[PDB]
Amino acid sequence: STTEVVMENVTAFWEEGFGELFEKAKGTPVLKDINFKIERGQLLAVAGSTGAGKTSLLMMIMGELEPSEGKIKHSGRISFCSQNSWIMPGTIKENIIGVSYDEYRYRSVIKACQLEEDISKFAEKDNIVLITLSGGQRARISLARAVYKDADLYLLDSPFGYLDVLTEKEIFESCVCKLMANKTRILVTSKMEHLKKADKILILHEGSSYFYGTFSELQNLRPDFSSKLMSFDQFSAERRNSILTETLHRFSL
Ligand SMILES: Nc1ncnc2c1ncn2[C@@H]1O[C@H](COP(=O)(O)OP(=O)(O)OP(=O)(O)O)[C@@H](O)[C@H]1O
Ligand SMILES: [Mg+2]
């Protein structure tokens, strides 16, 4: 199954004392007046400047950060892919599946994340003990682990680190848009292509919603903003994020 996710007028503080004070009241919040609704099986793309609250938003959904105002609604299990890849000492297989094995699911995830060719290189195949991996292999294994988990909501925080432009595109398509096409998911990204293929987009800046709605509505309701951001996707993660950050500081509020 999958869930809908709804946030209505949500405000949150990481400093729990302040969150209580604000709540009771009938520094500055990490997230302010956040609103979105994603339907079952839909993709929300979340972009924004550095420190804007993109990971914090995900942490709220996981219950690590509580709102001081507003309503969050969602049900079921959550799977989370962090923006920092991590590999535990053990086999490639163990890293992806943990303890529970489903052959058909495991095979579809390795294919979707392009891990077949990485696995096949080794004598032991996926029983190879984690051999040091490249950043890109680490990113793909971390993604595979998150997508393999049977969950009702998938939270993918910038999962495409150290990938080539073309293979990030291939994996966005095969994994996020095809394998997970019927799962509710939220993707943090800085690629315009990802925003374009999303059902909904949320742009965050200093904890506020700079824009929520559709890519074509962004093109329409934010023409001056779009005109800077739209060969952007060939730029490095760092450069895209610096351009997005600087543009947001210019046009915010
Ligand atoms: N557990 C926490 N406790 C206190 N403050 C936090 C915590 N997590 C994040 N913050 C702070 O909240 C702000 C938002 O950080 P967050 O990680 O949500 O930003 P981000 O938009 O994901 O940025 P990036 O583009 O760097 O990933 C930052 O000032 C950060 O230092
Ligand atoms: Mg983050």
AA identity, residue 144: A
Residues near 206 by beta carbon (within 8 Å), at least 6 away in sequence: 49, 51, 52, 252
Quote the distance between the C-alpha of residue 226 and its chain's center: 21
CA distance 225 to 2: 34
CA distance 67 to 129: 42
Q: Is 113 helix (H, G, I), strand (E, B) or coil?
A: coil
Residue 10's Cβ-side half-sphere holds a number of Cα atoms within 13 Å equal to: 25
Q: Which ligand 1 atom is nearest residue 158's CA?
A: 27
The number of helices, as runs of H, and strands, as runs of E, in the chain is: 11, 9
Q: What is the 3-state secondary structure (H, E, C) of 16-45?
A: HHHHHHHHHCCCCCCEEEEEEEECCCCEEE
C-beta pairs of 130-135 under 8 Å, 24+ apart in sequence: 130/87, 130/88, 130/89, 130/90, 130/91, 130/92, 130/95, 133/87, 134/162, 135/85, 135/161, 135/162
Ligand nearest to the backbone CA of 27: 1
Instruction: Report how this structure was experimentally obtained.
Output: X-ray
CA distance 84 to 102: 26
- In this structure, the number of other CB atoms found within 10 A of the CB of residue 16 comes to 11
19 is in an annotated binding site: no
CA distance 36 to 223: 22
Resolution limit, Å: 2.0
Residue-range domains of the chain with CATH: 1-253 (3.40.50.300)
- In this structure, the number of other CB atoms found within 10 A of the CB of residue 21 comes to 12
To test the pocket of ligand 1, the residue of 11, 18, 49, 56 to mutate (highest count of ligand atoms within 8 Å of its CB) is 56
45 is in an annotated binding site: no
